[PDB]
Amino acid sequence: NPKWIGRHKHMFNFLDVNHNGRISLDEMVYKASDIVINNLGATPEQAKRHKDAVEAFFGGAGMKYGVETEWPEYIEGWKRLASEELKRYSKNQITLIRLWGDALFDIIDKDQNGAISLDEWKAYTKSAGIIQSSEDCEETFRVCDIDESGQLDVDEMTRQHLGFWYTMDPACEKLYGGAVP
């Protein structure tokens, strides 16, 4: 699973505030709160809801306040969480990631219309530390926007999070690495 592992290594590095190669729940929750408040302009109410949910999400992966976790244990923790949460999702049940994604959604939905516009998505992608062209940002928006409505709903954004945090690499390759001639 090199692609899932790679997303997770880049995220571990992003949330490892002191850059020492070990991570705590304090680092992870600190950096996530800092971004929602200072990059995405969350209100106090918004930030507290997000804090509680992100704490439960990252806690589910086995991270704890006051404890430093090394990479092997970190990634095994995410594997375990992903496996349990994908079972819940398969049974149409509530997940920790869905609860997190709900609190985040309210914050990135700046115009409170219940859908994420392209502009809203550009701000969110930037908040996660991504630097990329307009064209690349638009492509990942189109990928997220399954019904091509032009805005991203809660279900689309849930699938987005599930794909990033939990979904393992496809078992088989496609002809042309999945490209179309």
Question: What is the contact surface with Ca ion in residues (CB under 5 A)?
Answer: 16, 18, 20, 22, 109, 111, 113, 145, 147, 149
Q: Which residue is nearest to Ca ion (CB)?
A: 149
User: Annotated binding residues for Ca(2+), as ranges?
Assistant: 16, 18, 20, 22, 27, 109, 111, 113, 120, 145, 147, 149, 151, 156
**Considering beta carbons, is residue 1 or 18 the nearer one to Ca ion?**
18
User: Does 161 participate in catalysis according to the annotation?
Assistant: yes
User: Does 89 participate in catalysis according to the annotation?
Assistant: no
CA distance 111 to 120: 9
How many Cβ atoms are within 10 Å of 138's Cβ, its own excluded?
A: 15
How many Cβ atoms are within 10 Å of 67's Cβ, its own excluded?
A: 13
* CA distances for 49 relative to 36, 43, 79, angstroms: 11, 10, 25
Catalytic residue (choose from 4, 8, 74, 121): 8
CA distance 154 to 152: 7
**Considering beta carbons, is residue 18 or 38 the nearer one to Ca ion?**
18
Mind telling me the catalytic residues? 8, 78, 124, 161, 176
